C-alpha cells in the first residue's frame, strides 16, 4: 500500500528492489546465496567449536586426574 | 595419576579456553549486527503501529473480528528458539515457562496447540509428544519473511474458520547485553493506546479513499501481523547471540580455575616422583 502527501510519501515494501527494471533479481539471488553460504559457514564453526573441542576436553576430564 | 595424563589435560584445556574466548569475541561482534537490524524495522513497526492506528480509525461503522474474544478455547502457542545449543539457559527457561503456562489452560482444560520455529523446539515437542501443524527449521540469522510466511499464513487460515479462539505468542525480550526475559504475550486482539497523534489535529474533511478502504485495512492487517511476527523472531535471534557471549566467557573462567587446580596437582606429583627416583638411586648405589 502507499500513503502520499506534500508532507510525506510512504510505501509498504512487501516485495521490492531498487534494481532499475523488472526481472533484475539475479544480484538479489546472488546475495541470498551468499547469505546462505555464510549461514553454512557459521553453523560449521558453531558445531566444530561447541562440540568437538568441549567433548574432547570433557571426556579427557572424564578420565580422573589422579 | 600419570604425569603425562595431567600434561595432556592441561594442554587440551588451554587450547579449548583459547578457542572459547575467540568464540566469545565472535559472538560479541555478532551481537550488535542484529541490534542494528532491529533498529531498522523498529521505526517500520512503529510507523506500522501508527498505520494500524490509522487503519482502525477508518470504516468507523464497519467492525473487524480481530478485535473481539470468542469463548476462550483452542489456545495456540508459537515458539521461537535456537536451532543450536549452548545458548545458556534461555532455551530451557523459555520451555519451562511454556509448559508451566500450558498447565494454566490445562488447569481449566483449554485445548492446547503449538507451532515451533526452533530446532531445539522441535526436538522438545517431539520428545514430549503431540501433533504439530507447523514446523520449520534452518531459518537463518536474517531470514526473509517468506521463510516464515507459511506458518503464520496456515495458522491464520485455520483461524478464519472460527475453529481457534486466539494465538498466544512466545519469544524472549532483550533488556540489556547481560539480561533477557522469557516473555509470553497475546497478539490477535489489538487495542490502540497513546495513538492520539493526528487525532487532536485531524483534518475536517473525511479521508475518502479511491481504493476500497473497506478491504484496504484487511491486507495491512495481515501485513501488520506478519511484520510483528518477523520483528519478534528477529528480536529473539538477536537475543540468542547475547546469551552465547556470557556462556563462553563463564566457560573460559571455569577452565582457568580447573587448570589452576590441575597445575597444583601436577606440581605435587612431580616433586613426589623426583624424590622417589632420587631415593631409589641412592639406595641402589648403596647396595653396590
From Swiss-Prot, chain B:
GO biological process annotation, one example: proton motive force-driven plasma membrane ATP synthesis
Q: What is its main location?
A: membrane
What keywords would UniProt list here? ATP synthesis, Cell inner membrane, Cell membrane, CF(1), Hydrogen ion transport, Ion transport, Membrane, Transport
- GO-annotated molecular function: ATP binding; proton-transporting ATP synthase activity, rotational mechanism
Compartments (UniProt record): Cell inner membrane
Regarding the membrane, this protein is recorded as:
Peripheral membrane protein
Q: Offer one Pfam family short name for this entry.
A: ATP-synt
Q: Which family does it belong to?
A: Belongs to the ATPase gamma chain family.
Q: What does this protein do?
A: Produces ATP from ADP in the presence of a proton gradient across the membrane. The gamma chain is believed to be important in regulating ATPase activity and the flow of protons through the CF(0) complex.
Q: What is this protein called?
A: ATP synthase gamma chain
Q: Which organism is it from?
A: Acinetobacter baumannii (strain ATCC 17978 / DSM 105126 / CIP 53.77 / LMG 1025 / NCDC KC755 / 5377)
Amino acid at each position: 500500500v502507499l500513503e502520499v502527501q506534500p508532507h510525506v510519501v510512504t510505501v509498504l515494501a512487501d516485495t521490492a528492489i531498487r534494481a532499475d527494471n523488472l526481472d533484475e533479481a539475479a544480484i538479489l539471488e546472488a546475495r541470498k546465496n551468499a547469505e546462505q553460504l555464510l549461514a553454512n559457514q557459521k553453523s560449521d564453526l558453531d558445531s566444530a567449536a561447541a562440540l568437538a573441542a568441549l567433548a574432547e576436553t570433557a571426556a579427557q576430564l572424564e578420565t580422573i586426574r589422579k | 595419576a600419570n604425569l603425562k595424563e595431567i600434561r595432556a589435560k592441561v594442554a587440551s584445556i588451554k587450547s579449548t579456553q583459547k578457542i572459547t574466548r575467540a568464540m566469545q569475541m565472535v559472538a560479541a561482534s555478532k551481537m550488535r549486527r542484529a541490534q542494528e537490524r532491529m533498529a531498522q524495522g523498529r521505526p517500520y513497526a512503529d510507523n506500522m503501529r501508527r498505520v494500524i492506528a490509522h487503519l482502525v480509525q477508518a470504516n468507523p461503522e464497519y467492525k473487524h473480528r480481530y478485535m473481539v474474544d470468542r469463548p476462550v478455547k483452542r489456545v495456540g502457542y508459537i515458539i521461537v528458539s535456537s536451532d543450536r545449543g549452548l545458548a545458556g539457559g534461555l532455551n530451557i527457561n523459555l520451555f519451562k515457562k511454556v509448559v508451566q503456562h500450558v498447565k494454566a489452560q490445562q488447569e481449566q482444560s483449554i485445548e492446547v496447540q503449538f507451532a515451533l520455529i526452533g530446532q531445539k523446539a522441535v526436538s522438545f515437542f517431539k520428545n514430549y509428544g503431540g501433533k504439530v501443524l507447523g514446523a520449520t527449521t534452518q531459518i537463518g540469522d536474517a531470514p526473509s519473511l517468506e521463510q516464515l510466511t507459511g506458518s503464520v499464513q496456515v495458522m491464520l487460515d485455520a483461524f478464519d474458520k472460527g475453529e481457534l479462539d486466539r494465538i498466544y505468542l512466545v519469544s524472549n525480550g532483550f533488556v540489556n547485553a547481560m539480561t533477557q526475559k522469557p516473555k509470553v504475550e497475546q497478539l490477535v486482539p489489538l487495542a490502540p493506546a497513546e495513538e492520539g497523534d493526528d487525532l487532536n489535529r485531524t483534518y475536517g474533511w473525511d479521508y475518502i479513499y479511491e481504493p476500497e478502504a473497506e478491504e484496504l485495512l484487511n491486507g495491512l492487517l495481515v501485513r501488520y501481523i506478519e511484520s510483528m511476527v518477523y520483528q519478534g523472531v528477529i528480536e529473539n535471534v538477536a537475543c540468542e547471540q547475547s546469551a552465547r557471549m556470557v556462556a563462553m566467557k563463564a566457560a573460559t573462567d571455569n577452565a582457568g580455575q580447573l587448570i589452576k587446580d590441575l597445575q597444583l596437582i601436577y606440581n605435587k606429583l612431580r616433586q613426589a616422583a623426583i624424590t622417589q627416583e632420587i631415593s631409589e638411586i641412592v639406595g641402589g648405589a648403596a647396595a653396590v
